[PDB]
Design a protein around this motif. Structure first.
Motif, PDB file in Angstrom:
ATOM      1  N   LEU A 122       0.880  -1.149   0.000  1.00  0.00           N
ATOM      2  CA  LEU A 122       0.000   0.000   0.000  1.00  0.00           C
ATOM      3  C   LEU A 122       0.933   1.218   0.000  1.00  0.00           C
ATOM      4  O   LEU A 122       2.022   1.155   0.554  1.00  0.00           O
ATOM      5  CB  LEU A 122      -0.817   0.004   1.294  1.00  0.00           C
ATOM      6  N   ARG A 123       0.530   2.312  -0.635  1.00  0.00           N
ATOM      7  CA  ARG A 123       1.343   3.528  -0.598  1.00  0.00           C
ATOM      8  C   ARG A 123       0.627   4.368   0.455  1.00  0.00           C
ATOM      9  O   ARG A 123      -0.414   4.951   0.177  1.00  0.00           O
ATOM     10  CB  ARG A 123       1.337   4.246  -1.948  1.00  0.00           C
ATOM     11  N   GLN A 124       1.181   4.424   1.662  1.00  0.00           N
ATOM     12  CA  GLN A 124       0.525   5.139   2.749  1.00  0.00           C
ATOM     13  C   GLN A 124       1.002   6.552   3.043  1.00  0.00           C
ATOM     14  O   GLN A 124       2.105   6.948   2.669  1.00  0.00           O
ATOM     15  CB  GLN A 124       0.637   4.328   4.041  1.00  0.00           C
ATOM     16  N   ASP A 125       0.147   7.296   3.738  1.00  0.00           N
ATOM     17  CA  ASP A 125       0.450   8.659   4.150  1.00  0.00           C
ATOM     18  C   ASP A 125       1.539   8.587   5.218  1.00  0.00           C
ATOM     19  O   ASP A 125       1.424   7.832   6.184  1.00  0.00           O
ATOM     20  CB  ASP A 125      -0.794   9.317   4.740  1.00  0.00           C
ATOM     21  N   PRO A 126       2.608   9.385   5.069  1.00  0.00           N
ATOM     22  CA  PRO A 126       3.715   9.387   6.030  1.00  0.00           C
ATOM     23  C   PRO A 126       3.349   9.532   7.501  1.00  0.00           C
ATOM     24  O   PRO A 126       3.827   8.765   8.339  1.00  0.00           O
ATOM     25  CB  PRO A 126       4.596  10.530   5.533  1.00  0.00           C
ATOM     26  N   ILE A 127       2.514  10.513   7.827  1.00  0.00           N
ATOM     27  CA  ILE A 127       2.130  10.721   9.220  1.00  0.00           C
ATOM     28  C   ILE A 127       1.443   9.503   9.815  1.00  0.00           C
ATOM     29  O   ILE A 127       1.840   9.005  10.864  1.00  0.00           O
ATOM     30  CB  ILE A 127       1.192  11.947   9.376  1.00  0.00           C
ATOM     31  N   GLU A 128       0.406   9.026   9.148  1.00  0.00           N
ATOM     32  CA  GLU A 128      -0.316   7.866   9.644  1.00  0.00           C
ATOM     33  C   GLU A 128       0.623   6.667   9.776  1.00  0.00           C
ATOM     34  O   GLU A 128       0.567   5.920  10.755  1.00  0.00           O
ATOM     35  CB  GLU A 128      -1.478   7.537   8.701  1.00  0.00           C
ATOM     36  N   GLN A 153      -9.882   8.076  17.039  1.00  0.00           N
ATOM     37  CA  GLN A 153     -11.172   8.411  17.616  1.00  0.00           C
ATOM     38  C   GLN A 153     -11.028   9.652  18.504  1.00  0.00           C
ATOM     39  O   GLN A 153     -11.799  10.605  18.390  1.00  0.00           O
ATOM     40  CB  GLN A 153     -11.653   7.224  18.439  1.00  0.00           C
ATOM     41  N   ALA A 154     -10.014   9.625  19.366  1.00  0.00           N
ATOM     42  CA  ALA A 154      -9.736  10.711  20.301  1.00  0.00           C
ATOM     43  C   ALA A 154      -9.136  11.987  19.706  1.00  0.00           C
ATOM     44  O   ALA A 154      -9.477  13.080  20.142  1.00  0.00           O
ATOM     45  CB  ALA A 154      -8.821  10.201  21.418  1.00  0.00           C
ATOM     46  N   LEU A 173      -0.381  16.495  12.995  1.00  0.00           N
ATOM     47  CA  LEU A 173       0.826  16.649  13.787  1.00  0.00           C
ATOM     48  C   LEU A 173       0.516  17.590  14.960  1.00  0.00           C
ATOM     49  O   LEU A 173       0.883  17.324  16.111  1.00  0.00           O
ATOM     50  CB  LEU A 173       1.911  17.243  12.887  1.00  0.00           C
ATOM     51  N   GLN A 174      -0.179  18.683  14.665  1.00  0.00           N
ATOM     52  CA  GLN A 174      -0.536  19.648  15.704  1.00  0.00           C
ATOM     53  C   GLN A 174      -1.325  18.982  16.811  1.00  0.00           C
ATOM     54  O   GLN A 174      -1.057  19.199  17.993  1.00  0.00           O
ATOM     55  CB  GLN A 174      -1.362  20.799  15.124  1.00  0.00           C
ATOM     56  N   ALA A 175      -2.296  18.160  16.435  1.00  0.00           N
ATOM     57  CA  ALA A 175      -3.112  17.487  17.437  1.00  0.00           C
ATOM     58  C   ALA A 175      -2.284  16.522  18.282  1.00  0.00           C
ATOM     59  O   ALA A 175      -2.407  16.495  19.510  1.00  0.00           O
ATOM     60  CB  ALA A 175      -4.272  16.745  16.763  1.00  0.00           C
ATOM     61  N   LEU A 176      -1.443  15.727  17.627  1.00  0.00           N
ATOM     62  CA  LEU A 176      -0.627  14.758  18.345  1.00  0.00           C
ATOM     63  C   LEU A 176       0.413  15.446  19.220  1.00  0.00           C
ATOM     64  O   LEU A 176       0.872  14.875  20.208  1.00  0.00           O
ATOM     65  CB  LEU A 176       0.063  13.798  17.362  1.00  0.00           C
ATOM     66  N   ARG A 202       5.987  16.398  18.662  1.00  0.00           N
ATOM     67  CA  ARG A 202       6.634  17.658  19.007  1.00  0.00           C
ATOM     68  C   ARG A 202       8.005  17.761  18.359  1.00  0.00           C
ATOM     69  O   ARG A 202       8.396  18.825  17.888  1.00  0.00           O
ATOM     70  CB  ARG A 202       6.739  17.792  20.525  1.00  0.00           C
ATOM     71  N   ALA A 203       8.729  16.649  18.307  1.00  0.00           N
ATOM     72  CA  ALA A 203      10.054  16.660  17.701  1.00  0.00           C
ATOM     73  C   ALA A 203       9.989  17.150  16.261  1.00  0.00           C
ATOM     74  O   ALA A 203      10.769  18.009  15.852  1.00  0.00           O
ATOM     75  CB  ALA A 203      10.672  15.258  17.758  1.00  0.00           C
ATOM     76  N   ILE A 204       9.048  16.610  15.496  1.00  0.00           N
ATOM     77  CA  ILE A 204       8.900  16.986  14.094  1.00  0.00           C
ATOM     78  C   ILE A 204       8.514  18.439  13.889  1.00  0.00           C
ATOM     79  O   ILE A 204       9.078  19.137  13.045  1.00  0.00           O
ATOM     80  CB  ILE A 204       7.828  16.123  13.393  1.00  0.00           C
ATOM     81  N   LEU A 205       7.536  18.888  14.659  1.00  0.00           N
ATOM     82  CA  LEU A 205       7.038  20.248  14.534  1.00  0.00           C
ATOM     83  C   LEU A 205       7.984  21.311  15.081  1.00  0.00           C
ATOM     84  O   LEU A 205       8.209  22.331  14.436  1.00  0.00           O
ATOM     85  CB  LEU A 205       5.685  20.349  15.242  1.00  0.00           C
ATOM     86  N   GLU A 206       8.554  21.057  16.256  1.00  0.00           N
ATOM     87  CA  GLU A 206       9.429  22.030  16.906  1.00  0.00           C
ATOM     88  C   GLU A 206      10.939  21.858  16.743  1.00  0.00           C
ATOM     89  O   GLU A 206      11.710  22.596  17.358  1.00  0.00           O
ATOM     90  CB  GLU A 206       9.079  22.086  18.392  1.00  0.00           C
ATOM     91  N   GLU A 207      11.372  20.904  15.920  1.00  0.00           N
ATOM     92  CA  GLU A 207      12.804  20.691  15.729  1.00  0.00           C
ATOM     93  C   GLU A 207      13.208  20.360  14.306  1.00  0.00           C
ATOM     94  O   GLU A 207      14.243  20.820  13.833  1.00  0.00           O
ATOM     95  CB  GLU A 207      13.305  19.569  16.633  1.00  0.00           C
ATOM     96  N   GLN A 208      12.395  19.569  13.618  1.00  0.00           N
ATOM     97  CA  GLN A 208      12.738  19.163  12.263  1.00  0.00           C
ATOM     98  C   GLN A 208      12.173  20.007  11.136  1.00  0.00           C
ATOM     99  O   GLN A 208      12.485  19.770   9.971  1.00  0.00           O
ATOM    100  CB  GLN A 208      12.356  17.696  12.054  1.00  0.00           C
TER     101      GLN A 208
END
Ligand SMILES: [Ca+2]
Ligand SMILES: [Ca+2]
Length: 314
Positions: A122-128, A153-154, A173-176, A202-208
DNA sequence: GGTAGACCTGGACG
DNA sequence: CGTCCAGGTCTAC
């Protein structure tokens, strides 16, 4: 009826087809095999899940892969939407050509391939993909599936409800990366994995550099991509390989887990030849990965999927 | 630098 | 019902 999950028989006019022989794809051997954890056979031979931000139900006959989508008036999927399905199953990649090649260079593969046709990637979405596999750590497919569904769900957007099932898109990403996410995930039973989801978000959003940093890895080389991914908390060599193979278009990436180790020993009488340890270890795992690559070639990860899937099915 | 341990949990088993 | 186990990763020693 107009309610509940649809079946080919119940709502004929709402389905559209995509030419696809069972030799090119077996839903029952792909969807529940540990690639994506978001598909369920709500009705015999009918699989429902979220694909490209919408809920779909899929089922196949010989030569045909039937698709139906729930978006405002109910109608059959359009060619564009259908194209999304084709891309998700990477139908341009001819599985019969790959099986032939793998089977010609590997007599054991040839034997297994006979009984398990249609296993593709399957070619999947990176985040998921990234967060789903962070949860795969010391876990089984059924449990992983539970954690992922509870997570979406949450923290994921509500899409639509069919029968008593409410589908959610995968969280952003923001939600997680939000406050108290770890604690909430721990209540959803993710255990120590809750920390890595929060930390990696947080690592991805605030560092990468954010989402862009992840997605552009698709244009990077396997070596590059795999190294970058291992930077993130909770992402080791196995998880990174799953992501490269399943979401970052690295068909040569070979996930080396316990199952592949057993397969290497049982079906190939394989042993480490340069590593120190006798069993699984970072040195030997890396070595085993190179072994499958030298055996199957550029699409070694896809070959790995056939055997892993066949080994699960047994 | 290669390597036992801790870090969580539900469906299993002898 | 105590010990296993499943698509691991992290790190002190
Ligand atoms: Ca394990
Ligand atoms: Ca890491």
């Amino acid at each position: 009826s107009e309610f509940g999950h649809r079946t080919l028989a119940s709502t004929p006019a709402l389905w559209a087809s995509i030419p696809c022989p069972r030799s090119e794809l077996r839903l029952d051997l792909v969807l529940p095999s540990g690639q994506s954890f978001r598909w369920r056979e709500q009705s015999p031979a009918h699989w429902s899940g979220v694909l490209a931000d919408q809920v779909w139900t899929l089922t196949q006959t010989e030569e045909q892969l039937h698709c139906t989508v729930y978006r405002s008036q109910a109608s059959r999927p359009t060619p564009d939407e259908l194209e999304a399905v084709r891309k998700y199953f990477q139908l341009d990649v001819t599985l019969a050509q790959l099986y032939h090649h793998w089977g010609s260079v590997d007599s054991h593969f040839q034997e297994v391939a006979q009984k398990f046709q249609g296993v593709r990637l399957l070619r999947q979405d990176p985040i998921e993909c990234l967060f789903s596999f962070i949860c795969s750590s010391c876990n089984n497919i059924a449990r992983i599936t539970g954690m992922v569904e509870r997570l979406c769900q949450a923290f994921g957007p509500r899409l639509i409800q069919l029968d008593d099932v409410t589908y959610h898109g995968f969280p952003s990403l923001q939600a997680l990366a939000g406050p108290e996410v770890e604690a909430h995930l721990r209540k959803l039973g993710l255990g120590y994995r809750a920390r890595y989801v929060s930390a990696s978000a947080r690592a991805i959003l605030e560092e990468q550099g954010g989402l862009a940093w992840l997605q552009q890895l698709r244009e990077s080389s396997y070596e590059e991509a795999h190294k970058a991914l291992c930077i993130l908390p909770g992402v080791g060599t196995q998880v990174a390989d799953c992501i490269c193979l399943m979401a970052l278009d690295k068909p040569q990436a070979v996930p080396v887990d316990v199952a592949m180790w057993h397969i290497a020993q049982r079906d190939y009488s394989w042993h480490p030849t340069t590593s120190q340890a006798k069993g699984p270890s970072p040195q030997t795992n890396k070595e085993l990965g190179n072994f499958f690559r030298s055996l199957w070639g550029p699409y070694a990860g896809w070959a790995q999927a056939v055997l892993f899937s066949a080994d699960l099915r047994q």
